[PDB]
């Protein structure tokens, strides 16, 4: 000053499409685009011996990944990720010098501030190194020194509120939780695009447990995914009504194939999705 | 840089009692003190033409009402409080000086967050207007300005962790959801006292989204109240099981009794209970 920005546990999914699509009420976004939105909603995923990659649609498992490496990494230029596409609308770009843009420096944005927050921004591959908060690492050093803590959280913002105003709030807060040598994850997002960045989000702060589970040397718990205006967008609603037509399979596994100690040290060759069955990819 | 820091809607509460009761695991909160406890709990109480100030025990609401127009007023004075006591444990403490903290001068705290973020202290009853992020102010004004706005959100800290660390996390984050003329909020607490801190919030931000409502000309829709770390004291579990037993009676009504127009105006006079018939005290 997204990402970001015994029943099945995906019948939670499901049913919160279907209480939308039969509950919701008409509301515009910011670019006056129309969904179906209901306020407050939370679902929770067992991380244990199974990862929450749903099974109703392909999940793109390969852009989670690697959208959450890139995060992790800190990174400010977007060419580092261009095996796909970030975060509508790209308004904040209209805050943004000619050069600086053309070069794919998208100024102190996303993962700057999980691992550098509030340092003073000069350009992508600059050494930021020791500057700002490192929300990240005091997670993990966090777990590591204090378990019990009820202080365990990190934020992300959209990039396009962080000139807007002063104090901006954040787009989603992710608490972590440990007991009995389990690692849990709380995520809240102010908003949720229920047919394409729900899913996404699920997969990505399933991933991020597992990766920090990993290097605490903590089993991962439950992810709980909780959101403020929970919305299908009005182009989606037949597309989803078909999806809800379709059986969950049981979930697939996460394997990470390699010991790692740090959290900077991840590869995307270190993950294995085992036993993953979806149903065909449905496009939104 | 608490408070803080169809079936009955009530039956949502007592299902969580019960479900910390039957599944949670012990853990320990900041003092070593024993707690049952499961991460990820949420309920909705409808606002509409009913209040949720909870039945199955009377629930203080002349504190409720007294500590929530004290925030509101960003006092830092304790004195201003003299009628009950806010905020275990009181460890921020030893973070003042000996002066200071005899009179009732509490440091940049509670709702000085509210009215003043960021602002530079100097002493309680000194003139902060116009300085800080005014976060109640603001969400007044969006409400007003744009209602399809998802980013309508405010956050109260305990004043333990402002010397603590920089950038340290809330406790609580509120987000405000408009939509067909009614106000909604949700509360997200990082930890909530099952016993005695929840029902006194979920009364708190009920009477808040009340307050919001009146003066921006809308009706009170839903309060969503979201936990991270939902826990009961061990020396609580006794009166626990016995409020248990006992049936939720309909809600109450709250009643605004004069046209106010701006939040600073309100005064307890302004608000009555109506039709509260609680089950008897619980001390806990």
């Given at each position: 000053?997204?990402?970001?920005?015994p029943?099945?546990?995906?019948?939670?999914?499901?049913?919160?499409?279907?209480?939308?699509?039969?509950?919701?009420?008409?509301?515009?976004?910011?670019?006056?685009?129309?969904?179906?939105?209901?306020?407050?909603?939370?679902?929770?995923?067992?991380?244990?011996?199974?990862?929450?990659?749903?099974?109703?649609?392909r999940?793109?498992?390969?852009?989670?990944?690697?959208?959450?490496?890139?995060?992790?990494?800190?990174?400010?230029?977007?060419?580092?990720?261009?095996?796909?596409?970030?975060?509508?609308?790209?308004?904040?770009?209209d805050?943004?010098?000619?050069?600086?843009?053309?070069?794919?420096?998208?100024?102190?944005?996303?993962?700057?501030?999980?691992?550098?927050?509030?340092?003073?921004?000069?350009?992508?591959?600059?050494?930021?190194?020791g500057?700002?908060?490192?929300?990240?690492?005091?997670?993990?050093?966090?777990?590591?020194?204090?378990?019990?803590?009820?202080?365990?959280?990190?934020?992300?913002?959209?990039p396009?509120?962080?000139?807007?105003?002063?104090?901006?709030?954040?787009?989603?807060l992710?608490?972590?939780?440990?007991?009995?040598?389990?690692?849990?994850?709380?995520?809240?997002?102010?908003?949720?695009?229920?047919?394409?960045?729900?899913?996404?989000?699920?997969?990505?702060?399933?991933?991020?447990?597992?990766?920090?589970?990993?290097?605490?040397?903590?089993?991962?718990?439950?992810?709980?995914?909780?959101?403020?205006?929970?919305?299908?967008?009005?182009?989606?609603?037949?597309?989803?009504?078909?999806?809800?037509?379709?059986?969950?399979?049981?979930?697939?596994?996460?394997?990470?194939?390699?010991?790692?100690?740090?959290?900077?040290?991840?590869?995307?060759?270190?993950?294995?999705?085992?036993?993953?069955?979806?149903?065909?990819?449905?496009?939104?």
């Amino acid at each position: 000053l997204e990402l970001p920005r015994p029943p099945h546990g995906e019948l939670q999914y499901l049913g919160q499409i279907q209480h939308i699509l039969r509950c919701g009420v008409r509301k515009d976004d910011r670019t006056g685009t129309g969904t179906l939105s209901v306020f407050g909603m939370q679902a929770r995923y067992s991380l244990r011996d199974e990862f929450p990659l749903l099974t109703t649609k392909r999940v793109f498992w390969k852009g989670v990944l690697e959208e959450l490496l890139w995060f992790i990494k800190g990174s400010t230029n977007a060419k580092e990720l261009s095996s796909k596409g970030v975060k509508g609308s790209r308004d904040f770009l209209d805050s943004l010098g000619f050069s600086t843009r053309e070069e794919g420096d998208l100024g102190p944005v996303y993962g700057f501030q999980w691992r550098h927050f509030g340092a003073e921004y000069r350009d992508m591959e600059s050494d930021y190194s020791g500057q700002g908060v490192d929300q990240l690492q005091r997670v993990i050093d966090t777990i590591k020194t204090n378990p019990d803590d009820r202080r365990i959280i990190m934020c992300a913002w959209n990039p396009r509120d962080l000139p807007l105003m002063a104090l901006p709030p954040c787009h989603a807060l992710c608490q972590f939780y440990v007991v009995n040598s389990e690692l849990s994850c709380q995520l809240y997002q102010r908003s949720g695009d229920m047919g394409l960045g729900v899913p996404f989000n699920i997969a990505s702060y399933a991933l991020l447990t597992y990766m920090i589970a990993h290097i605490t040397g903590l089993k991962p718990g439950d992810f709980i995914h909780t959101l403020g205006d929970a919305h299908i967008y009005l182009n989606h609603i037949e597309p989803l009504k078909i999806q809800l037509q379709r059986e969950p399979r049981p979930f697939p596994k996460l394997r990470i194939l390699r010991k790692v100690e740090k959290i900077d040290d991840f590869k995307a060759e270190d993950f294995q999705i085992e036993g993953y069955n979806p149903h065909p990819t449905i496009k939104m």
